Design a binder for this molecule. Structure first.
Ligand SMILES: O[B-]1(O)OCc2ccccc21
Ligand SMILES: [Zn+2]
Length: 257
């Protein structure tokens, strides 16, 4: 099965998922000098006040904080998007070292980690149908740098001991994802894909320019998770990022000058 090892990592994925070599794969390097300011892009609307978190899950490649997406409780609209996209989950990608971990890069710079807030287009009725459409998902990507702690991340960090291994879940109610946002909503946007198998080309990526700061202790706790299940040999959950893919025939647009 796929993973992030030498024998099953990103360079192998194309054998089971040939779309790995497709025309709109993610992540990509964001060349800030060639990204085009698009003055017709709208401000993003992030409406998370009624968000209902439910659970946190170690799925063997990351941990997902899951939300009730059975109503328009936490939605992303505006920006490059047409219509309303509902928050279903968030997760992170991170490194073994502070110098790597992000999936997107900025002028080839790698951040320590990257947060993905995943939303699906309500016109398709549910997530499974949405991922079969070219405009099915909107993923808000936020870079993490190591410095001062992010207070709003700590509740996540503190529950990780209860989901150390693959397949473990825990209740995770009343978590406010607003506490994970930077001050500015300036962004880059481009059409792309899931960054994990099945690598479906269904994502409008919205990557924020401003990183959030997390502490060394916070990201160290991410690195204590396991890819393996309980009672299997311990494999630390680190370097669960796909490297940048060819931009091909795409333009990255900026919401800001
Ligand atoms: O980054 B990912 O490919 O990992 C799992 C996932 C789920 C939803 C959207 C994007 C992703
Ligand atoms: Zn992701």
């Amino acid at each position: 099965h796929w993973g992030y090892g030498k024998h099953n990592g990103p360079e192998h994925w194309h054998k089971d998922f040939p779309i790995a070599k497709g025309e709109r794969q993610s992540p990509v390097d964001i060349d800030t000098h060639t990204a085009k300011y698009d003055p017709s892009l709208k401000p993003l609307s992030v409406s998370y006040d009624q968000a209902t978190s439910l659970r946190i899950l170690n799925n063997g490649h990351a941990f997902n904080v899951e939300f009730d997406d059975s109503q328009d409780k936490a939605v992303l609209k505006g920006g490059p998007l047409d219509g309303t996209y509902r928050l279903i989950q968030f997760h992170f990608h991170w490194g073994s070292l502070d110098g790597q971990g992000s999936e997107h890069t900025v002028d080839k710079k790698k951040y320590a980690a990257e947060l993905h807030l995943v939303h699906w287009n309500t016109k398709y009725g549910d997530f499974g149908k949405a991922v079969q459409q070219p405009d099915g998902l909107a993923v808000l990507g936020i870079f993490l740098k190591v410095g001062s702690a992010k207070p709003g991340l700590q509740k996540v960090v503190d529950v990780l001991d209860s989901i150390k291994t693959k397949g473990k879940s825990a209740d995770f109610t009343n978590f406010d994802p607003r506490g994970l946002l930077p001050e500015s909503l300036d962004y880059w946007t481009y059409p792309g894909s899931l960054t994990t198998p099945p690598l479906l080309e269904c994502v409008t990526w919205i990557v924020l320019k401003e990183p959030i700061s997390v502490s060394s202790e916070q990201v160290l706790k991410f690195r204590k998770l396991n890819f393996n299940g309980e009672g299997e040999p311990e494999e630390l959950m680190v370097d669960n990022w796909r490297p940048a893919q060819p931009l091909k025939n795409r333009q990255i647009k900026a919401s800001f000058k």
